[PDB]
Design a protein around this ligand. Structure first.
Ligand SMILES: OC[C@H]1O[C@@H](O[C@H]2[C@H](O)[C@@H](O)[C@H](O[C@H]3[C@H](O)[C@@H](O)[C@H](O[C@H]4[C@H](O)[C@@H](O)[C@H](O)O[C@@H]4CO)O[C@@H]3CO)O[C@@H]2CO)[C@H](O)[C@@H](O)[C@@H]1O
Ligand SMILES: [Cl-]
Ligand SMILES: [Cl-]
Ligand SMILES: [Cl-]
Ligand SMILES: [Cl-]
Ligand SMILES: [Cl-]
Ligand SMILES: [Cl-]
Ligand SMILES: [Cl-]
Ligand SMILES: [Cl-]
Ligand SMILES: [Cl-]
Ligand SMILES: [Cl-]
Ligand SMILES: [Cl-]
Ligand SMILES: [Cl-]
Ligand SMILES: [Cl-]
Ligand SMILES: [Cl-]
Ligand SMILES: [Cl-]
Ligand SMILES: [Cl-]
Ligand SMILES: [Cl-]
Ligand SMILES: [Cl-]
Ligand SMILES: [Cl-]
Ligand SMILES: [Cu+2]
Length: 235
């Protein structure tokens, strides 16, 4: 159970984005139905009044929270991966449009899930804004909690992989467009009952065997991190 509070740009807090530049749902409950229209941008996908200005190469940091800013972020039971996707805003997230910029799942080197490191990072994870065409974009940040994922939701609706999905409205101003954004995958549709990484038993299957759901990270992606970029409590 987690939500995005807002974003940072080059380590500068853009301030509370909820219902402003984030297409905030009404609560922190997960999406679980893989075929739901709610897979695109969660249950209340509409244009919000603001879009955060960025340039290609900027560090764009998403900041999550559970109940209040810079709290426990997400229950520690909610082990799983984190991804970030981009689509042109004109699509409203419809069609074959989502391109993956970032994936982190289970890190063998430090024996931790992305969500574990998200909590340590005070809810902050970043991407480098890619060299796509200037314009308006949706950045879809997705946490998959796998603590009940041994079942398919389609078999047992009380269980299933949990998707915490947040779409931020970002405007890319300066960009050399050296990596034009290609077509991507649809949400809903990219994840199905048979997709690797959706049905996974964290209790009995080693995390060193976990493969996050495709698609793979785009060749044009510039990278990211899970790391605290700013101190919320210095406000
Ligand atoms: O054993 C089951 C499973 O539970 C996981 O814990 C989940 C709970 O199942 C879930 O019910 C709980 O939901 C909370 C949510 O986290 C809170 O953010 C929300 O708070 C409300 C509050 O109740 C209202 O009074 C107020 O106005 O709004 C806030 C929202 O800011 O309350 C909901 C409803 O209870 O979330 C838990 C995860 O955080 C365990 O983690 C897991 O290990 C277990 O397997
Ligand atoms: Cl839960
Ligand atoms: Cl700057
Ligand atoms: Cl809801
Ligand atoms: Cl709900
Ligand atoms: Cl916890
Ligand atoms: Cl197409
Ligand atoms: Cl390990
Ligand atoms: Cl950190
Ligand atoms: Cl242009
Ligand atoms: Cl099942
Ligand atoms: Cl482009
Ligand atoms: Cl382009
Ligand atoms: Cl293409
Ligand atoms: Cl696979
Ligand atoms: Cl990948
Ligand atoms: Cl690619
Ligand atoms: Cl790609
Ligand atoms: Cl490329
Ligand atoms: Cl910091
Ligand atoms: Cu939860």
């Amino acid at each position: 159970h987690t939500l995005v509070w807002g974003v940072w740009v080059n380590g500068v807090d853009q301030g509370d984005g909820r219902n402003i530049y984030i297409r905030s749902p009404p609560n922190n409950n997960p999406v679980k139905n893989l075929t739901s229209p709610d897979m695109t941008c969660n249950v209340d996908n509409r244009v919000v009044p603001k879009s955060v200005p960025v340039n290609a190469g900027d560090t764009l940091t998403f900041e999550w929270y559970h109940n209040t800013r810079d709290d426990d972020i997400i229950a520690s039971s909610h082990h799983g991966p984190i991804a970030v996707y981009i689509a042109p805003a004109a699509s409203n997230g419809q069609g074959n449009v989502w391109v993956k910029l970032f994936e982190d799942a289970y890190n063998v080197t430090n024996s931790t899930w992305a969500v574990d490191r998200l909590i340590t990072a005070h809810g902050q994870h970043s991407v480098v804004v890619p060299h796509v065409a200037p314009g308006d974009y949706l950045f879809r940040a997705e946490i998959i909690a796998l603590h009940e994922a041994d079942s398919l939701y389609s078999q047992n609706p009380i269980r299933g992989a949990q998707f915490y999905i947040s779409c931020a409205q970002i405007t890319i101003n300066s960009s050399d467009d050296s990596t034009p954004l290609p077509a991507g995958v649809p949400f809903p549709g990219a994840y199905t009952d048979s997709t690797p990484g959706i049905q996974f038993n964290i209790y009995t299957t080693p995390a060193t065997s976990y493969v996050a759901p495709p698609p793979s990270v785009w060749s044009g992606a510039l990278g990211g991190s899970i790391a605290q970029v700013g101190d919320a409590s210095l406000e």
